[PDB]
Symmetry: C3
Subunit: 207 residues, 3 copies
């Protein structure tokens, strides 16, 4: 707990955190400390578990990112961080292309190589992972995850906490419900309800 | 119809136009006006339908882009624009990587995150959509469309007006005929004739 | 054989060489000469076959790249180049995003539009082709090839000389053996042994 003045606190110290740390540093931000349920990651000290959050706030740190891949858990930890007085920053790699008409929430991760086009809306705590494409007029719910190299072809709505695996694709105009999982490589050609798993080309719900 | 001096006229005012407008603006270009069959889009005024083109030309506007996703219609409107005295500009996002040995036509859209490698030839009115990859020695016919996140692995020939859906892939050396559609996620491993639909991994013609 | 002082010698004069030449030139490097088994490529002279390597070294050229797509052959030619006193450079397009914690070998090609994330290790003579994504904590063996638009979702190990075709995907944590081929579009969801061919969504070994 001896820390510099002013950087970003990270919740989570795993592989996702490594990537987030590098996005932040590529933008010139400083990462102050990690809190992890196992109480360094790329040189950032792990100072305790989530019980350390009040102490971090008290010492003047007020900016935070939740680097937890699990969508439901990330969402819960973002709420906890905000209750403790932290503001949720975004971690947007400088190579990502984010159109000027995109609406971004808070606590959003946007990895290297991403493109997000016109009039897309990105909810709080979303992850738009490495190389993913979000075409025009998409709506991404809070705490969803578009996995690496996934692609949404415009007018796609993705529900809260939905997860698209590596290389998933969605054709124009499709809606995917909250809490749904699209497997790696799945090609979604019809609306998906909430709380299902869909896999394949074309993607099919698996009971 | 009171317009500034010198910008680009856009045919079409839909979702594709939004993305094109943003590509042009990212390059420092000004978008003058839209003509749309329904007679603003991201702040660009819609001044009429295609019957307004002569009036736009008369007032000194001479640069145009056809922002219409339908390949056959785009091609026809490009001809009409040229007959009315417009030059067809390209709309190439600054993040796109276009090799110095690529040959580009006119009226070409190249979206964010694209890469086009050595000695590829891109016909007039092609769309190389968001995140698409065109490897070395490809030949893209006039008014074709490589959809978002699609990839051509080198030495691929794509016929006039062909359309590759989101995330389609083509292995080296394959030829795809004019007017053919490859569904989203289709993986093309053999030449395709003209005027067919192919879907799947590997892609198969669907009667 | 009259050559400038100081550039890079390229082994191979085919389509892959074209792309490599352009990567090098985009970084401000000069390409001195090609040696090719058939004894110009984008303006670089072909000066002989591999028997010309001693003469090139004698005249002061000492930097080399092996632009041969075949993995086993590339590996053998890299050894031969090093025995002749050449150092193997990397050919990394300036648009590629290579995290600061990535470990790179020598003789590595990294094409336009690539992203490689935290704590990934890239073996000598690997090819990370156009638009490919290598997420955190990956291990790429010597002389492997990640084809255009392929994606590894983190914690993936790729054996020596393995080849992933255009648009292949690998889910987190998977190991792929040496000398294995994943077909274009294959989605690898389980470890693959050495010396197999796997195709499909999900990828399945083909006898
Ligand atoms: Cl830091
Ligand atoms: Cl996030
Ligand atoms: Cl289904
Ligand atoms: Cl404008
Ligand atoms: Cl176009
Ligand atoms: Cl067929
Ligand atoms: Cl040169
Ligand atoms: Cl290489
Ligand atoms: Cl199998």
């Amino acid at each position: 707990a001896s820390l510099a003045i002013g950087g970003v606190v990270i919740i989570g110290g795993g592989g996702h955190a490594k990537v987030v740390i590098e996005s932040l540093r590529a933008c010139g931000e400083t990462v102050a400390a990690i809190v992890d349920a196992d109480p360094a990651v790329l040189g950032v000290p792990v100072v305790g578990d989530d019980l350390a959050l009040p102490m971090l706030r008290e010492q003047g740190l007020s900016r935070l990112f939740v680097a937890i891949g699990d969508n439901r858990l990330r969402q819960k930890l973002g709420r906890k961080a905000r209750d403790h007085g932290f503001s949720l920053v975004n971690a947007i790699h400088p190579s990502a292309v984010v159109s000027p008409s995109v609406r971004l929430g808070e606590g959003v991760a946007v990895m290297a190589g991403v493109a997000i086009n016109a009039d897309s809306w990105i909810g709080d705590l979303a992850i738009i992972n490495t190389g993913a494409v979000v075409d025009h007029d998409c709506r991404l719910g809070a705490a969803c995850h578009l996995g690496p190299a996934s692609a949404l072809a415009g007018g796609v709505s993705v529900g809260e906490r939905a997860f698209l695996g590596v290389g998933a694709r969605v054709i124009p105009g499709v809606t995917i419900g909250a809490d749904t999982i699209v497997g790696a490589g799945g090609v979604v050609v019809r609306d998906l309800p909430d709380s299902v798993l869909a896999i394949g080309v074309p993607a099919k719900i698996k009971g």
